[PDB]
Design an enzyme around this catalytic site. Structure first.
Site, PDB file in Angstrom:
ATOM      1  N   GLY A 219      37.754  54.761  40.523  1.00 51.01           N
ATOM      2  CA  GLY A 219      37.433  55.723  40.776  1.00 51.01           C
ATOM      3  C   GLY A 219      36.772  56.133  42.084  1.00 51.01           C
TER       4      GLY A 219
ATOM      5  CG  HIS B  35      37.522  45.779  47.651  1.00 55.94           C
ATOM      6  ND1 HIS B  35      37.869  46.170  46.241  1.00 55.94           N
ATOM      7  CD2 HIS B  35      38.051  44.576  48.010  1.00 55.94           C
ATOM      8  CE1 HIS B  35      38.561  45.109  45.953  1.00 55.94           C
ATOM      9  NE2 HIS B  35      38.866  44.111  46.783  1.00 55.94           N
ATOM     10  CG  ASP B  36      38.029  51.683  46.334  1.00 56.27           C
ATOM     11  OD1 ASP B  36      38.280  50.846  45.701  1.00 56.27           O
ATOM     12  OD2 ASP B  36      37.096  52.813  46.207  1.00 56.27           O
TER      13      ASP B  36
ATOM     14  CG  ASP C  80      40.205  40.779  46.192  1.00 57.51           C
ATOM     15  OD1 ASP C  80      40.165  41.978  46.360  1.00 57.51           O
ATOM     16  OD2 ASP C  80      40.960  40.340  45.298  1.00 57.51           O
TER      17      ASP C  80
ATOM     18  N   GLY D  36      34.319  50.207  41.123  1.00 52.12           N
ATOM     19  CA  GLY D  36      34.626  50.472  39.673  1.00 52.12           C
ATOM     20  C   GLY D  36      35.596  51.658  39.843  1.00 52.12           C
TER      21      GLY D  36
ATOM     22  CE1 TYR E 155      42.288  35.822  45.883  1.00 51.90           C
ATOM     23  CE2 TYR E 155      43.155  37.708  45.233  1.00 51.90           C
ATOM     24  CZ  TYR E 155      42.113  37.206  45.371  1.00 51.90           C
ATOM     25  OH  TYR E 155      40.796  37.504  44.984  1.00 51.90           O
TER      26      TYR E 155
HETATM   27  O1  LIG Z   1      35.346  45.801  39.144  1.00 53.32           O
HETATM   28  C1  LIG Z   1      35.394  44.491  39.583  1.00 53.32           C
HETATM   29  O2  LIG Z   1      36.065  43.920  39.287  1.00 53.32           O
HETATM   30  C2  LIG Z   1      34.241  43.980  40.386  1.00 53.32           C
HETATM   31  C3  LIG Z   1      34.542  44.501  41.860  1.00 53.32           C
HETATM   32  C4  LIG Z   1      34.313  45.876  42.108  1.00 53.32           C
HETATM   33  C5  LIG Z   1      34.887  47.097  42.396  1.00 53.32           C
HETATM   34  C6  LIG Z   1      35.688  46.909  43.572  1.00 53.32           C
HETATM   35  C7  LIG Z   1      36.750  46.093  43.041  1.00 53.32           C
HETATM   36  N1  LIG Z   1      37.086  45.305  41.803  1.00 53.32           N
HETATM   37  C8  LIG Z   1      38.496  45.169  41.749  1.00 53.32           C
HETATM   38  O3  LIG Z   1      38.854  44.984  40.829  1.00 53.32           O
HETATM   39  N2  LIG Z   1      38.851  45.860  42.679  1.00 53.32           N
HETATM   40  C9  LIG Z   1      37.918  46.725  43.434  1.00 53.32           C
HETATM   41  C10 LIG Z   1      37.691  48.204  43.173  1.00 53.32           C
HETATM   42  S1  LIG Z   1      36.369  48.383  43.960  1.00 53.32           S
HETATM   43  O4  LIG Z   1      36.533  48.514  45.588  1.00 53.32           O
END
Ligand SMILES: O=C(O)CCCC[C@H]1[C@H]2NC(=O)N[C@H]2C[S@@]1=O
Length: 121
Positions: free
Chosen positions: A31, A47-48, A89, A29, A64
């Site tokens: 931050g 993932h960030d 993703d 989420g 995508y």
């Molecule tokens: O918030 C969501 O959409 C669920 C996914 C989990 C958080 C990760 C992910 N969600 C998103 O849309 N981009 C990234 C930021 S964090 O790595």
């Protein structure tokens, strides 16, 4: 885009992306600081970092395409940004699936001051 991602996470894990993975720990989420709390949080951290490898891409909004081959996620050909966002993703969804056995509701809404640094990608 947030659309492919959230549906990919629900397919993989049976959990709604919002709210199960959108305020979890220090990285899932909006931050991110400090040491990831658990494996699921580390998925979000990576993932960030993965998105950070793509400073001129726009993963929230760029859609995508992917498909299922034998149940596996397979990113389909698009722009370079789209392909790379999809791979980011995909990995996160698989990482969330792999760590469902340690997912803990106690990390939802985790407060920002407890995200005691530090971790480089
Ligand atoms: O918030 C969501 O959409 C669920 C996914 C989990 C958080 C990760 C992910 N969600 C998103 O849309 N981009 C990234 C930021 S964090 O790595």
């Amino acid at each position: 885009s947030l659309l492919e991602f959230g549906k990919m996470i629900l397919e993989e894990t049976g959990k709604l992306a919002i709210p199960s993975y959108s305020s979890y720990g220090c990285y899932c989420g909006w931050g991110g600081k400090g040491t990831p709390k658990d494996a699921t949080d580390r998925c979000c951290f990576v993932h960030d970092c993965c998105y950070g490898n793509l400073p001129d891409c726009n993963p929230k909004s760029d859609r995508y395409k992917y498909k299922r081959v034998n149940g596996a996620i397979v990113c389909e050909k698009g722009t370079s940004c789209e392909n790379r966002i999809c791979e980011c993703d995909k990995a996160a969804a698989i990482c969330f699936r792999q760590n469902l056995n340690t997912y803990s509701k106690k990390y939802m809404l985790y407060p920002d001051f407890l995200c005691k640094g530090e971790l480089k990608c």
